[PDB]
Amino acid sequence: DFLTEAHLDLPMEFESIGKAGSRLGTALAMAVDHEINMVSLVRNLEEFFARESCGWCTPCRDGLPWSVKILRALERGEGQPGDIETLEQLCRFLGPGKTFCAHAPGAVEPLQSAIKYFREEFEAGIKQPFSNTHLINGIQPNLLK
Amino acid sequence: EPAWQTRDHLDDPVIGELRNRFGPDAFTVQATRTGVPVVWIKREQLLEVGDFLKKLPKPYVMLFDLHGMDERLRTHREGLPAADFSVFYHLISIDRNRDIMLKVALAENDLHVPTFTKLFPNANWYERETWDLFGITFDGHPNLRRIMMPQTWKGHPLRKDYPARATEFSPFELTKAKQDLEMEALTFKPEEWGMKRGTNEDFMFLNLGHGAFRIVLQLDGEEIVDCVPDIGYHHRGAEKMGERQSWHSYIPYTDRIEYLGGCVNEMPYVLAVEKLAGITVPDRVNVIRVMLSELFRINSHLLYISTFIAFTDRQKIYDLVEAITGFRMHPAWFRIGGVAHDLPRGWDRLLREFLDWMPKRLASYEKAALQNTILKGRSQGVAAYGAKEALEWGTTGAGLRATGIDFDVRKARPYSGYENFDFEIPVGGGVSDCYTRVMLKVEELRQSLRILEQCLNNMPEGPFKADHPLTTPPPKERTLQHIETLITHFLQVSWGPVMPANESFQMIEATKGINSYYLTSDGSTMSYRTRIRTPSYAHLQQIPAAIRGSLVSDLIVYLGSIDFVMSDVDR
Amino acid sequence: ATIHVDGKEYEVNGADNLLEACLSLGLDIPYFCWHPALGSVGACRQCAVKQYQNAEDTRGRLVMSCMTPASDGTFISIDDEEAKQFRESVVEWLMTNHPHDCPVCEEGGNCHLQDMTVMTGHSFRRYRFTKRTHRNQDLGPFISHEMNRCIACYRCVRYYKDYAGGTDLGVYGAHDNVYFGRPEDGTLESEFSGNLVEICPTGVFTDKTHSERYNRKWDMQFAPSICQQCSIGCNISPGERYGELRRIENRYNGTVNHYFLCDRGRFGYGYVNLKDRPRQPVQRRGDDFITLNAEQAMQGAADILRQSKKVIGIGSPRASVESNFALRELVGEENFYTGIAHGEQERLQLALKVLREGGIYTPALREIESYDAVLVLGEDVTQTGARVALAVRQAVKGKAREMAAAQKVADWQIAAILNIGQRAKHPLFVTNVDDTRLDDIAAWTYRAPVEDQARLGFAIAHALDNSAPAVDGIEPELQSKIDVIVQALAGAKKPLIISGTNAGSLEVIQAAANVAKALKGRGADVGITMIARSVNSMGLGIMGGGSLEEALTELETGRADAVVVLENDLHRHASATRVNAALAKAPLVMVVDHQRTAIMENAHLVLSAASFAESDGTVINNEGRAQRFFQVYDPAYYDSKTVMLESWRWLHSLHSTLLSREVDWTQLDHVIDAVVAKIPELAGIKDAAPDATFRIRGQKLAREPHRYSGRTAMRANISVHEPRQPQDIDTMFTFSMEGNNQPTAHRSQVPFAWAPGWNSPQAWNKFQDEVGGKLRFGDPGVRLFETSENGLDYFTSVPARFQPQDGKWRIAPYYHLFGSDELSQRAPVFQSRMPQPYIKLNPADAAKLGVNAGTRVSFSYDGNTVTLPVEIAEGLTAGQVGLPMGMSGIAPVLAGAHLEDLKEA
Amino acid sequence: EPVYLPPRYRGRIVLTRDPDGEERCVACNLCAVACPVGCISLQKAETKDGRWYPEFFRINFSRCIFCGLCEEACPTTAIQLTPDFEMGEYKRQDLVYEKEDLLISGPGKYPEYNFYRMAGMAIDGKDKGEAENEAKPIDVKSLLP
Ligand code: SF4
Ligand code: SF4
Ligand code: SF4
Ligand code: SF4
Ligand code: SF4
């Protein structure tokens, strides 16, 4: 998980970082400066995690590319309503115990931490109205409210 | 807690009263989606329970329905007593505005129930039909003969081992049936019909020729002493078709019951299927369904008033319905979860042109009805009954409200958002003759035009199909574009939608009274049981008890005054 | 164990996983990657339930029900909102890349993915991005490949590799571009590749033969039948549409063929749909062929039979028990001859004597998978009884199963089992004239002539028990390998000896009986399996009768002047010149057959019999199991002039017209009662299936699904008036959907599996008592005989070793799953899969002949010189020449014969 | 005077073509199973390029109740009910309309829809990945991770 400047005073232990919403991990921390857009960073992370999937289990194999495509759309300014909630549901349903191994929980940890802290950049990615269906001429669409 | 939630209705006061009277172990309360407390009674306590319900402080006064069910192939019978067959009794209390369904379980080797003709006289025809179609005997019945099939019929067609489809035609049996129809007047035996004192010897037996049916008449000169109407000439086996079509593909058959109704007959079926499916439809669906049902009710009422005493008004309605649905008589347009299409661009223009042109026609109809002294001399005072006679015979609709009993389904038990529309219910005096019924139908025509004005004026914007996964079929543009919608459409039009196993019920105010669909799902893609209660059945059974001592012309006028069709009677 | 699902208490097996336990209770949990026969892996992540620590736990945790044991005091929720949400999410993630293909997909209406998409409640797409796509492969004539529809559930590779043992199907690639197929374009090599069309829950692997004449599942007319393509008797669901046989689906039988067929029985049904079949009785008058109806054909045949002095009847192992018995009644018991040769009959009756008198219990096909050691003697099991080869593979994997059970690893956790038992497997010892397809898992393979295989069997029996006759001249290295076999067979708890009549040696069967008797003498739980040649070979053996040679002798000597040939072409059991001369000598030949055979040119009357699709009957397994097969469709429903009756119906009416000069189209149960009255050893066939009066609460059993389409249009081009529904007086089934096919109905004959919400072959879970067990009220079929109380004696006729003599060439039989069977090789889709006619030679013999690989040599057998191209076989022994049995010009009766004048053409 | 029929009017049934001029029917048999009367009968054939089409197609119009459920069930919009009611016949056998009596030369009421532009199955003129919302097939031997 990403952590903020307020978390910088925590001792690098398993228990202290675990109580902060992250894991100590390999203890090799990486510093993100203010010039780095969080949506592009998380897009890079999810692109890595999606293409390093082994393909065995459905949530990682077919739910990390969905997050990658959403983050590419938000990075291009082509996001649509539903995208951030789809990212949050992908974070929820790729957690521990939902996938075969721990590649996908660790994959979606930066995503949920970035949506939790830097939600403004993700929300600024959304610019288009939602549409995944073209008009068929003789058929009147069912206008769901 | 939606309206379609499975309930047991243990908070109903009838359950506490029955428990305090008969003991807690006397009956089994079943959880259904019928909206009704369904209790299973022992066969030996059945007349006692019926007599107890008849004498409550707000008594159950009307036997709404009585029929059978073949429970042999029903697998999901959890929480139910062991039954090979069952007989259900739907009883309606109007003062309480409640109803109860008693169920009697029967083994295959002992198919006989005590009769209700000493409590509710419409049980006569109901028990005759239950005997004809299921083979269940009712002990004490005055004449338990076949009512739907001919008397020389082998087997009981609503049993689960009886094949639904048509057997091979034979000219052999055809010429036998022709030769017994030629010799029927020569060999008329007046106890194969329930008659008595057959040839006094001044009495004459004739047969008379809204559908074609026979009625045997017993005459003292020109006075009617007794009559029995011979029905079943219009029997189509619609309930059997309910057991042999998918839930989606049974809709045209629902149209062809009460053929003047159209969408009015469509409505209770899709409402009961949506109760089975756990579907709540949006407001645009509710308003579309109300608008189409009121258009067809206006059409049926205009035909009834024109018959009793025209072509332009029904033509305008038929063009509007043809533009919306693609068909005039049997639109087949209501769907499970919504309607088949959205409203066409230009529906409001046609409805506004129909509503701006109708009130002057209504004023003309009221002039031709309430100012016609020849009609006011020919019609009133003849074939008249009060509230007590209408309640005990299951009379609904214009006759019941013409007896002064303020009972309409659209107000007492609202459905499809009828409580959002402001409309009045006309109720007459204490006398239900031809004249009062006709003026009640005229006032209902006025109120239906009010409902149509409210449908036109504030029509909701939104979907014409529900968001539910069981909406059959799904919206066509998503079907043609999206693979999961294509999958749902594929399996919903081929194998059929799977309704989870439950029992549902919906009663509506049809054009001729109260029409109800009682649907039993065994968890499959077809109906396990489709019970259709139609008002023309109960209205036709009241004909012998209403013209005792009238003349044959008075019988003809009475037949004209009752709004009925033979498809509604026989289904 | 005790589990609580959504607050309801259930009693289950604690050794099962929660998915199979909950499916056995009728609860619906969506699943893709789990199969009852393949075990649990946890790939698809679809079967999520919510587990709680105890009764007073509310938060829970999503667990995967196929990887969770159904232990005692378990608390799960299927209908939890989070579990339902996650299962819908898994379906959604699968749907993100799935092609918009359902109208043009052969799996539609039969698709497990369609069913689970509907069941999870997912019908709204919110994915707007692109779908991944894949190129397709060419997998041969039987399987059609469409990788777009794949959901990466790994069932195909798990089945084809871990279960069927095939080697040319795999998974390639990575993250979301995983590809399931062959490493290159080409035909799938496994004999059980056809079961991929039912293992795969999507439309990736589909029946190409059915795709040629596709119809949806709701449009089929199904019947429960028995596969006719060898002796194993696998239960099938043949389904027809518009008067032609369309598909062979697997019919679940927890005792025989549970989930799987072989490719021969699945794809060699196409002889039924041939357009040159007899469809009407035809009488030869001069050079004219007069078409008759049933009545005048019976009258003319009866008059000719009455004016003749002796009438003989030649049956077949193709025909049912009822048909062979009807011929036996028509011609007389002493005049009835089995249509097989004398040597084939001798081997068949020895196999029957070993089965029903040897005192060793013969296992069912399912029970073969529980034996601890397997010795296969002479029988090429993969090419003649293929499902026995698959069951042998499972029994071989039993060792890894035992090793994993020793470490307290559950039986469904197949990956842990395969990891613990790395390459350890139960001992398998096969013998053949060359290499087999079981050599990859065989602990030892012996390539030798049939005499030397029999001698190895006799030596194994002598080393197991010294009372068995000894074999002299065993080489020290062969004696060491015999000692290896003896140490493996003696230490096994459950040894199994498999042999059969296809090896062409009586002594191989005697040696197998000797090994089984020696193992039984040591107290071992030994079983013996015999592979017969045809579908009703053991039934024809139990019925008995003279050989084909005796019938030809009667015809040639003139003692018989009328011959009735039932479902026999007579060229696969005798020489064609002798058969042709003997049938040309007879003044009446009457062939009751459903296929245009070569003996119909000499025939004076041809009765258009019905095949298994157009007829009812009983056939006897290779293990002695009587099984009923029911008629699929009425042949006369579309073509009104088709007179294609059951063979026993023809023969019973011919007998009645010979006796009392009136036709009598009887009923099937009358013929069955006649069989069980006249032949007491066939009395078990009465209980094979119930009679025609059997009802489920008063209604017959439905042959076609309840949503059957086209009722008032499928025959409208012939006549707009709808004909009468065909009447089935013979069986409890009706030729309509006005009937019962409920999964909870008290029957054992299920025409097809369908439940509301389960339109796929996964609907079989509803028809079973526990999933992967038996059918809910028992499997169909009945064993004719029990295990005898007393055994046989040791066979002391030990043959001498094979001596390769100059000029002669011992014909070594090679069998092919596609080509050795007669009717299946007539099916037009098999000619692509058929091997080319190749005569196999040793390198030494071919070098002596001056012949290399591919050049054509000519040899004369029975005065007939034929030419075949030479294939070099290293595994063959010198002095032997390899021939493919059952192909064109090579009768299976040549197995063991000698050859003359093998020279280059 | 001629009778006016609205565009939704449920009359004589036709099989239509796509904008390319080929018949829209893929012989999926959904219309036949959705027919409550069972008066549709057809058979699937395939072209050399793998295009599914009806080998024959027949409608028993003496049985047909003109309910429009087949058109509603068609997922290619091939089968349509057109505003035409003049179908009286001398013989009932002539009321069985074969494919030559049903296949019109145009798209009917739906002027643009093409099911084979949306299906993933490869036909002639549409290779793999050339349909709507479909990426090009990535070869499994690709150098990219
Ligand atoms: S979470 Fe692990 S097991 Fe699942 S696909 Fe990803 S890398 Fe493979
Ligand atoms: S595999 Fe199933 S869901 Fe996919 S296209 Fe075929 S029928 Fe449709
Ligand atoms: S090809 Fe079929 S069985 Fe194999 S992984 Fe894909 S969907 Fe599963
Ligand atoms: S093993 Fe034999 S009986 Fe079974 S499917 Fe194959 S050919 Fe048929
Ligand atoms: S309109 Fe209705 S009855 Fe006519 S072919 Fe179509 S589905 Fe069948």
Ligand code: SF4
């Ligand atoms: S539903 Fe449409 S595409 Fe499918 S078979 Fe019928 S007309 Fe053809």
Ligand code: FES
């Ligand atoms: S069935 Fe359990 S995860 Fe696939």
Ligand SMILES: [Ca+2]
């Ligand atoms: Ca038969």
